[PDB]
Amino acid sequence: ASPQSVRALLERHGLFADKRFGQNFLVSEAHLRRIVEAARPFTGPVFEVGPGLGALTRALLEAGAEVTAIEKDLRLRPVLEETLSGLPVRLVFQDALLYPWEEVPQGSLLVANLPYHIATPLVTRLLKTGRFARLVFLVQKEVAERMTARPKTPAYGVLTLRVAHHAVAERLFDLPPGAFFPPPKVWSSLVRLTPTGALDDPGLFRLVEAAFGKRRKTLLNALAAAGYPKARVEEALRALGLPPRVRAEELDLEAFRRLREGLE
């Protein structure tokens, strides 16, 4: 893969990169290799969402992964068949947001150059399945920052705590716009999530989502606004030794879990 090879491949197939599909294709073989290495060992079947021109798909397959590749853009079928000629892969033409994720084998892996517009809801769904051993994927740098944020930083929020609840999170490296054709407007990052097997905790997330809803308020006032009894919230913060005017972004996962318990 190279900027010239990718441009040439698109042109030969009559393709354009379509923004409606968030198409930005990997253009660096070295980066492809680093993504594959980050996903090893392939202890379970691999799912790739958005195989595109098949560059990562081919590298995964050559590394011995058993791959299902889910692509929404049917126009990519000819180039994918060409790229993957002779190689065992399940190509599925479907919107990945509609794929039956809850039924994948326990121990499955995700390895993907995700389209920006589905990355957050897709990863959130896959985490809620509890079916994955590892998820390795590209997201915009700001989204990687949310997924790996520490408390009291701009990026810290509901997505940080959603990820933390289910999985260990790592931002492994960043990729400049030039690693893709066409180049996006922002940097990307390779994120690795390793699930602990924890499933959704809807009560905890009702609390977390209420906490971050009203961004201008203290935590107490945010939760009171969402219908939590104020006296009960006051007492629970106090019992935890937290300042009365503590803000939502100052609490870590442990603190939210204990706040929840105090309230019930």
Ligand SMILES: CSC[C@H]1O[C@@H](n2cnc3c(N)ncnc32)[C@H](O)[C@@H]1O
């Ligand atoms: C970053 S390149 C994104 C890849 O994902 C594909 N894609 C975009 N939207 C979806 C979706 N909902 N399901 C599966 N693949 C998608 C694009 O066509 C491209 O190959």
